[PDB]
Enzyme design. Sequence first.
Site, PDB file in Angstrom:
ATOM      1  N   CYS A 252      28.805  57.873  20.249  1.00 38.32           N
ATOM      2  CA  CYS A 252      29.378  59.058  19.603  1.00 38.32           C
ATOM      3  C   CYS A 252      28.774  59.307  18.239  1.00 38.32           C
ATOM      4  O   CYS A 252      28.915  58.481  17.332  1.00 38.32           O
ATOM      5  CB  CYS A 252      30.935  58.935  19.484  1.00 38.32           C
ATOM      6  SG  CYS A 252      31.681  60.300  18.568  1.00 38.32           S
TER       7      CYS A 252
ATOM      8  N   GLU B  12      25.698  70.450  23.037  1.00 42.38           N
ATOM      9  CA  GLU B  12      26.474  70.095  24.230  1.00 42.38           C
ATOM     10  C   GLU B  12      26.697  71.295  25.172  1.00 42.38           C
ATOM     11  O   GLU B  12      26.576  71.178  26.417  1.00 42.38           O
ATOM     12  CB  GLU B  12      27.826  69.523  23.805  1.00 42.38           C
ATOM     13  CG  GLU B  12      27.714  68.221  23.008  1.00 42.38           C
ATOM     14  CD  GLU B  12      29.119  67.629  22.764  1.00 42.38           C
ATOM     15  OE1 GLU B  12      29.658  66.980  23.684  1.00 42.38           O
ATOM     16  OE2 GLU B  12      29.663  67.814  21.667  1.00 42.38           O
TER      17      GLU B  12
ATOM     18  N   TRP C 227      35.675  68.248  18.395  1.00 38.24           N
ATOM     19  CA  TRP C 227      35.108  69.613  18.438  1.00 38.24           C
ATOM     20  C   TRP C 227      33.656  69.447  18.877  1.00 38.24           C
ATOM     21  O   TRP C 227      33.113  68.311  18.804  1.00 38.24           O
ATOM     22  CB  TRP C 227      35.195  70.311  17.083  1.00 38.24           C
ATOM     23  CG  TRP C 227      34.657  69.526  15.923  1.00 38.24           C
ATOM     24  CD1 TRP C 227      33.331  69.394  15.544  1.00 38.24           C
ATOM     25  CD2 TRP C 227      35.413  68.794  14.972  1.00 38.24           C
ATOM     26  NE1 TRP C 227      33.231  68.594  14.457  1.00 38.24           N
ATOM     27  CE2 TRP C 227      34.491  68.218  14.063  1.00 38.24           C
ATOM     28  CE3 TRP C 227      36.786  68.555  14.794  1.00 38.24           C
ATOM     29  CZ2 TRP C 227      34.903  67.425  12.975  1.00 38.24           C
ATOM     30  CZ3 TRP C 227      37.198  67.755  13.711  1.00 38.24           C
ATOM     31  CH2 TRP C 227      36.262  67.206  12.818  1.00 38.24           C
TER      32      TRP C 227
ATOM     33  N   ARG D 299      31.347  60.010  14.544  1.00 38.48           N
ATOM     34  CA  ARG D 299      32.268  58.966  14.109  1.00 38.48           C
ATOM     35  C   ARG D 299      32.562  58.948  12.628  1.00 38.48           C
ATOM     36  O   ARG D 299      33.436  58.207  12.215  1.00 38.48           O
ATOM     37  CB  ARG D 299      31.773  57.589  14.546  1.00 38.48           C
ATOM     38  CG  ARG D 299      31.973  57.331  16.050  1.00 38.48           C
ATOM     39  CD  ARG D 299      31.382  55.972  16.315  1.00 38.48           C
ATOM     40  NE  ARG D 299      29.923  56.031  16.512  1.00 38.48           N
ATOM     41  CZ  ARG D 299      29.168  54.943  16.584  1.00 38.48           C
ATOM     42  NH1 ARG D 299      29.733  53.745  16.406  1.00 38.48           N
ATOM     43  NH2 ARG D 299      27.857  55.039  16.844  1.00 38.48           N
TER      44      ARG D 299
HETATM   45  C1  HEM Z   1      35.213  65.336  15.977  1.00 36.82           C
HETATM   46  C2  HEM Z   1      34.102  65.774  16.592  1.00 36.82           C
HETATM   47  C3  HEM Z   1      33.288  64.930  17.596  1.00 36.82           C
HETATM   48  C4  HEM Z   1      31.997  65.171  17.837  1.00 36.82           C
HETATM   49  C5  HEM Z   1      31.127  66.285  17.190  1.00 36.82           C
HETATM   50  C6  HEM Z   1      31.544  64.240  18.835  1.00 36.82           C
HETATM   51  C7  HEM Z   1      30.274  64.192  19.335  1.00 36.82           C
HETATM   52  C8  HEM Z   1      29.898  63.524  20.487  1.00 36.82           C
HETATM   53  C9  HEM Z   1      28.705  63.741  21.313  1.00 36.82           C
HETATM   54  C10 HEM Z   1      27.667  64.852  21.003  1.00 36.82           C
HETATM   55  C11 HEM Z   1      28.708  62.839  22.308  1.00 36.82           C
HETATM   56  C12 HEM Z   1      27.708  62.577  23.464  1.00 36.82           C
HETATM   57  C13 HEM Z   1      26.245  62.993  23.197  1.00 36.82           C
HETATM   58  C14 HEM Z   1      26.013  64.434  23.631  1.00 36.82           C
HETATM   59  O1  HEM Z   1      26.943  65.021  24.259  1.00 36.82           O
HETATM   60  O2  HEM Z   1      24.913  65.013  23.332  1.00 36.82           O
HETATM   61  C15 HEM Z   1      29.893  62.028  22.135  1.00 36.82           C
HETATM   62  C16 HEM Z   1      30.240  60.977  22.949  1.00 36.82           C
HETATM   63  C17 HEM Z   1      31.421  60.261  22.894  1.00 36.82           C
HETATM   64  N1  HEM Z   1      32.435  60.404  21.948  1.00 36.82           N
HETATM   65 FE1  HEM Z   1      32.449  61.775  20.419  1.00 36.82          FE
HETATM   66  N2  HEM Z   1      32.578  63.348  19.121  1.00 36.82           N
HETATM   67  C18 HEM Z   1      33.697  63.791  18.416  1.00 36.82           C
HETATM   68  C19 HEM Z   1      34.953  63.236  18.536  1.00 36.82           C
HETATM   69  C20 HEM Z   1      35.292  62.152  19.355  1.00 36.82           C
HETATM   70  C21 HEM Z   1      36.636  61.610  19.465  1.00 36.82           C
HETATM   71  C22 HEM Z   1      37.855  62.230  18.705  1.00 36.82           C
HETATM   72  C23 HEM Z   1      36.560  60.522  20.254  1.00 36.82           C
HETATM   73  C24 HEM Z   1      37.690  59.569  20.701  1.00 36.82           C
HETATM   74  C25 HEM Z   1      38.822  59.470  19.989  1.00 36.82           C
HETATM   75  C26 HEM Z   1      35.187  60.374  20.689  1.00 36.82           C
HETATM   76  C27 HEM Z   1      34.662  59.405  21.519  1.00 36.82           C
HETATM   77  C28 HEM Z   1      33.458  59.496  22.203  1.00 36.82           C
HETATM   78  C29 HEM Z   1      33.097  58.669  23.327  1.00 36.82           C
HETATM   79  C30 HEM Z   1      33.886  57.473  23.925  1.00 36.82           C
HETATM   80  C31 HEM Z   1      31.745  59.151  23.765  1.00 36.82           C
HETATM   81  C32 HEM Z   1      30.952  58.556  24.931  1.00 36.82           C
HETATM   82  C33 HEM Z   1      31.434  59.349  26.134  1.00 36.82           C
HETATM   83  C34 HEM Z   1      30.751  58.926  27.407  1.00 36.82           C
HETATM   84  O3  HEM Z   1      30.327  57.763  27.511  1.00 36.82           O
HETATM   85  O4  HEM Z   1      30.647  59.781  28.319  1.00 36.82           O
HETATM   86  N3  HEM Z   1      34.437  61.345  20.070  1.00 36.82           N
HETATM   87  N4  HEM Z   1      30.560  62.429  20.983  1.00 36.82           N
HETATM   88  C1  LIG Z   2      35.569  63.681  22.488  1.00 42.99           C
HETATM   89  C2  LIG Z   2      34.200  64.323  22.597  1.00 42.99           C
HETATM   90  C3  LIG Z   2      33.830  65.349  21.724  1.00 42.99           C
HETATM   91  C4  LIG Z   2      32.558  65.927  21.856  1.00 42.99           C
HETATM   92  N1  LIG Z   2      32.144  66.902  20.992  1.00 42.99           N
HETATM   93  N2  LIG Z   2      31.718  65.532  22.840  1.00 42.99           N
HETATM   94  C5  LIG Z   2      32.056  64.543  23.703  1.00 42.99           C
HETATM   95  C6  LIG Z   2      31.084  64.105  24.789  1.00 42.99           C
HETATM   96  C7  LIG Z   2      31.387  64.805  26.103  1.00 42.99           C
HETATM   97  C8  LIG Z   2      30.299  64.642  27.181  1.00 42.99           C
HETATM   98  C9  LIG Z   2      30.657  65.083  28.464  1.00 42.99           C
HETATM   99  C10 LIG Z   2      29.783  65.012  29.554  1.00 42.99           C
HETATM  100  N3  LIG Z   2      30.185  65.455  30.786  1.00 42.99           N
HETATM  101  C11 LIG Z   2      28.496  64.495  29.370  1.00 42.99           C
HETATM  102  C12 LIG Z   2      28.101  64.050  28.098  1.00 42.99           C
HETATM  103  C13 LIG Z   2      26.696  63.499  27.923  1.00 42.99           C
HETATM  104  C14 LIG Z   2      26.081  63.086  29.257  1.00 42.99           C
HETATM  105  C15 LIG Z   2      24.716  62.418  29.160  1.00 42.99           C
HETATM  106  C16 LIG Z   2      24.063  62.091  27.970  1.00 42.99           C
HETATM  107  C17 LIG Z   2      22.806  61.467  28.040  1.00 42.99           C
HETATM  108  C18 LIG Z   2      22.064  61.105  26.760  1.00 42.99           C
HETATM  109  C19 LIG Z   2      22.205  61.200  29.274  1.00 42.99           C
HETATM  110  C20 LIG Z   2      22.895  61.531  30.436  1.00 42.99           C
HETATM  111  N4  LIG Z   2      22.373  61.283  31.671  1.00 42.99           N
HETATM  112  N5  LIG Z   2      24.119  62.115  30.350  1.00 42.99           N
HETATM  113  C21 LIG Z   2      28.988  64.117  26.992  1.00 42.99           C
HETATM  114  C22 LIG Z   2      33.320  63.945  23.595  1.00 42.99           C
HETATM  115 CL   LIG Z   3      30.871  69.376  27.801  1.00 44.21          CL
END
Ligand code: HEM
Ligand SMILES: Cc1cc(N)nc(CCc2cc(N)cc(CCc3cc(C)cc(N)n3)c2)c1
Ligand SMILES: [Cl-]
Lengths: 411, 407
Positions: free
Chosen positions: B106, B283, B278, B109
């Site tokens: 993430c 994304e 957010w 963070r």
């Molecule tokens: C506040 C704004 C937040 C932003 C901008 C954000 C951004 C992102 C992004 C961009 C990714 C994945 C990389 C991509 O999609 O390109 C991600 C993954 C993730 N985030 Fe965040 N995040 C936010 C809040 C949170 C919150 C509130 C949580 C949990 C309380 C969280 C937990 C995670 C987790 C566990 C992943 C990995 C998800 C997975 O493995 O599929 N994030 N975050």
């Molecule tokens: C809470 C929260 C907030 C926020 N703004 N964004 C998220 C992440 C949500 C997310 C959702 C999906 N379905 C896939 C990915 C990456 C899927 C992926 C990434 C990479 C690098 C390779 C691959 N194969 N797939 C990220 C969570």
């Molecule tokens: Cl999404």
Amino acid sequence: RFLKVKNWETDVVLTDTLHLKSTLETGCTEHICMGSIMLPVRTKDQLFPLAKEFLDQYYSSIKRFGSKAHMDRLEEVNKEIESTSTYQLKDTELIYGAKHAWRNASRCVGRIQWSKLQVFDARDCTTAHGMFNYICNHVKYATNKGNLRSAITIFPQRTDGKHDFRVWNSQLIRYAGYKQPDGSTLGDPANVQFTEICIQQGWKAPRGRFDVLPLLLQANGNDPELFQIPPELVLEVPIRHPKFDWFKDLGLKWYGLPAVSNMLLEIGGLEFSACPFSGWYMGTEIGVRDYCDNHRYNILEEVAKKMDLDMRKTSSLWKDQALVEINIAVLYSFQSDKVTIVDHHSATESFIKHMENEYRCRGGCPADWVWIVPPMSGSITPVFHQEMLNYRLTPSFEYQPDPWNTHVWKG
Amino acid sequence: RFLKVKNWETDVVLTDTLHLKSTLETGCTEHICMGSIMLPTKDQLFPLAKEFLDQYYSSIKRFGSKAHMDRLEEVNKEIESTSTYQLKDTELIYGAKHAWRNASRCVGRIQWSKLQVFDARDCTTAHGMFNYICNHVKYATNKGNLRSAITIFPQRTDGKHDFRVWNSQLIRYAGYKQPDGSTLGDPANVQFTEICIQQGWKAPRGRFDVLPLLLQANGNDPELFQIPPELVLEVPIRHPKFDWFKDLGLKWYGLPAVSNMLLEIGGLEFSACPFSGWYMGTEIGVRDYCDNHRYNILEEVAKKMDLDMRKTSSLWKDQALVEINIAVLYSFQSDKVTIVDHHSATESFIKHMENEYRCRGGCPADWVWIVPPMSGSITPVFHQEMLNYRLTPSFEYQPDPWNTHVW
Ligand code: HEM
Ligand SMILES: Cc1cc(N)nc(CCc2cc(N)cc(CCc3cc(C)cc(N)n3)c2)c1
Ligand SMILES: [Cl-]
Ligand code: HEM
Ligand SMILES: Cc1cc(N)nc(CCc2cc(N)cc(CCc3cc(C)cc(N)n3)c2)c1
Ligand SMILES: OC[C@@H](O)[C@@H](O)[C@H](O)[C@H](O)CO
Ligand SMILES: [Cl-]
Ligand SMILES: [Cl-]
Ligand SMILES: [Cl-]
Ligand SMILES: [Zn+2]
Ligand SMILES: [Zn+2]
Ligand SMILES: [Zn+2]
């Protein structure tokens, strides 16, 4: 063990068995992944198993495994190692080994080409002047008036480690960088340290923005010697843009031949510390890295300014817009001048086809996603959604310390 | 035991000591790196509880105190007797915040400590789950001024009374296989949509149909609920310069809320724990719009732009990608819906990571996910070496519930 990789775009699943042949360490453990870390004399005892492993691979590849020829060769090498502490590769083995080092290079997106490598055997070389001649010949052959051809030149192997051949340049062709008293840099910031060394060694620097560096060449552990590559052998491309007529007045150009000269080639346990190799560029290497890294030519601001983008906020994506236009220019310029270049879409599409073929015929294709995915537009190329396994197969190319750090100066 | 990470842009070197607290496995070995693989009893519970309580008591500067020792005994006693234990509200909040802090994938963070934690451990039914989720959605959305939140349903017991949200995100679009052979709507959600239909959802069969929630309480069969449409904030997508862009009929939802992961705190397992933040603009504009197996709009956009699509080397795809991402950011900004661009988010992450190294001894991070899916090299995370390792509390993947559920 069978290991599965999935493609998240196609759901295609491939099975890796080649990982069972992996040797050296990745830097990773069960507790820590070092996947994004850039960098994480042999005894008789160590050498014969290494030589045997290589020869077994070579003879399998020629469908002569277990033949009299295979057995005789193992015995010949064994005797050579016991009585000399080393051995000599046959020319066929050296060709095979160099091609495999490329085939095994996990960070290389260009490996579809691996079997088409011209190998120049320079193991008879004894002096820096000799190295200079071999390197000129390599450049001329590889350049081929812009119809680029992959090549490697292989200098004598390491013996006691006190007699190494080294190319002190990181690439055969690269631009000088000059740190100014006001803290600015003229030319390429990546080459400041090496440029200072060349100057110290006697190079009369032109001090312009794109001065081709002299070769600094070490033979047989001797102090290195300076040589200017004949200018007529250095093919360069002035950079212009197909729609923006002011792009040319940026005064940009780049050289056509990417030729890495600072890596070590390991074949059958033998170490080739001077083994310059060259291919042709993928456009983003020039357009993204060399031009737009902040610690390189750093042209993003200037370009966006000339484009009159809104630079007040990053959210206009002005940086991204300029980046794409520069990369367009690089590809347009090379194509217009008939100098071989590949765009990152073509290159990654070919890699995935190569990779799938390698899975079928070889049981695997080690690959480092961090390096394979291009430095712009990653997700829209077919490698982004492809799972890869990274592991180390020999023969291989390896990093080695810059030689000014380790060289014993003779005077 | 001490690991160095270098920034290749600044030459700045940082030392990680936090990895010595890593517990779960990476998937990698000395022989093979799995860095780019997406998914690589009573006796067991007390050490995990102790590990967690120790970190908690250290965090509030009471390590080795009587209150620390008394709590450890209390929990030991409770596991001995009940086979499980219950977190104090303080521990639940600390644990959820730290599972976010520890999420190596993430980029967002820097915000970890500001998380609003809604304790839903008193929930007993699917209808209760629906109420808690609407409240989370309304609170998090906050009329477009988005606020991070998590809602935590009851922990796993014997594993046959699991609470689960069957949806992968609280808000997402339906996907429908057509007689045509093409997909209408979001291809990522085809299977889940069919299950909803199987369970009785009257599908509108449009391109952007907000899916119903499928909620499972107490291991019971999951139940269907429609999120009040007035609580689902959406943004129509237009471009500040191309007037034709709105004609594509594109929109997206404002609230990214992951609802299919598992929260582990002190050995306890929270199988339903939807969390939201957010969006980072890429994304929606790169992944959701431009992946070939998603809305796959690159070709239509490039056509409208009149780009030369004869040859890849014109970089028409790259051109259209940038424009799509400009339009997403512009649209969210114009409607006053929180969004962050990839330059700003990655800059904030580098600032966070430095903070974490200095105050915590490190910051586990997965470069493959931290580097944005476009323009990677021109963001400050590309040239930053990272170390990836697994700390608890954590968010984990778990299997989709339809493969597991006993009806
Ligand atoms: C506040 C704004 C937040 C932003 C901008 C954000 C951004 C992102 C992004 C961009 C990714 C994945 C990389 C991509 O999609 O390109 C991600 C993954 C993730 N985030 Fe965040 N995040 C936010 C809040 C949170 C919150 C509130 C949580 C949990 C309380 C969280 C937990 C995670 C987790 C566990 C992943 C990995 C998800 C997975 O493995 O599929 N994030 N975050
Ligand atoms: C809470 C929260 C907030 C926020 N703004 N964004 C998220 C992440 C949500 C997310 C959702 C999906 N379905 C896939 C990915 C990456 C899927 C992926 C990434 C990479 C690098 C390779 C691959 N194969 N797939 C990220 C969570
Ligand atoms: Cl999404
Ligand atoms: C033929 C055209 C070639 C192309 C387009 C190509 C492309 C590239 C690119 C793009 C990278 C690094 C990723 C990046 O810079 O963005 C790379 C890395 C590398 N390539 Fe190639 N390559 C080619 C030929 C070769 C040849 C001929 C060899 C050796 C025989 C080679 C060996 C390597 C090695 C060892 C690396 C890793 C370098 C390092 O770790 O620093 N490649 N290639
Ligand atoms: C023979 C050959 C042909 C050809 N066309 N290209 C090459 C690769 C040359 C290369 C040279 C340098 N100086 C840096 C990199 C990546 C440096 C890098 C990449 C990543 C992903 C991260 C990081 N920190 N640094 C690659 C070799
Ligand atoms: O100026 C010296 C540098 O060019 C040199 O140290 C390189 O960074 C190094 O050889 C790695 O390529
Ligand atoms: Cl380069
Ligand atoms: Cl780089
Ligand atoms: Cl994705
Ligand atoms: Zn790894
Ligand atoms: Zn770079
Ligand atoms: Zn994607």
